Amino acid sequence: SLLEFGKMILEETGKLAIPSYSSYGCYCGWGGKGTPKDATDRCCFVHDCCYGNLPDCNPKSDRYKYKRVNGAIVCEKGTSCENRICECDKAAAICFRQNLNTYSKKYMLYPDFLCKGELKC
Numbered sequence: 001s002l003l004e005f006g007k008m009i010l011e012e013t014g015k016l017a018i019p020s021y022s023s024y025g026c027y028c029g030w031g032g033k034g035t036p037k038d039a040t041d042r043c044c045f046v047h048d049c050c051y052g053n054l055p056d057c058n059p060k061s062d063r064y065k066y067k068r069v070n071g072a073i074v075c076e077k078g079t080s081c082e083n084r085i086c087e088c089d090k091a092a093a094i095c096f097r098q099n100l101n102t103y104s105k106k107y108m109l110y111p112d113f114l115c116k117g118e119l120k121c
C-alpha cells in the first residue's frame with residue numbers, strides 16, 4: 001500500500017516520501033510521461049512500469065508484509081499481488097537509495113508540460 005511504500009522509502013533513504021518523492025520529475029507519484037530527468041526519476045519510471053505489469057493489482061490499497069534480513073528488505077509471502085507489489089516497491093526504495101548521490105530538489109514539483117520525450121517500459 002501507499003503508506004507502506006512511504007515507510008520503506010523513509011527507512012531506505014532518511015527522506016519522507018511526501019514531499020521528497022511524491023512529485024519528483026516526470027514519473028514519480030501521479031504523472032508519468034516523457035523523458036525521466038535523472039536517475040531517481042528513472043526509479044519512478046521503472047516503478048511505474050512495475051505497477052503497470054500488474055493491471056489486476058491495487059498497489060495503493062493492497063498491504064503486503066516485509067521484513068529485514070541484514071537491513072535487506074525481504075518480501076514475505078502474501079497474495080500473488082502483494083508479493084509482486086512488494087517486489088516493485090522494494091526495487092524502487094533501493095533505487096532511490098542507490099541514487100541519493102544525484103537526488104536534486106529542483107525536480108520536486110516538476111512541471112507536467114516539461115515531460116515530453118517518450119519511453120516504452
Ligand SMILES: C[C@]12C[C@H](O)[C@H]3[C@@H](CCC4=CC(=O)CC[C@@]43C)[C@@H]1CC[C@@H]2C(=O)CO
Nearest residue numbers: 002003005006017018021022023028029044
Ligand atoms: C507513493 C509515494 C509513497 C507515499 O506513501 C505517498 C505517495 C503520494 C501520495 C500519498 C498519500 C498519503 O497520504 C500517504 C503517502 C502517499 C500515499 C508517494 C509519492 C511518492 C512515493 C512514490 O514515489 C510513488 O511514485
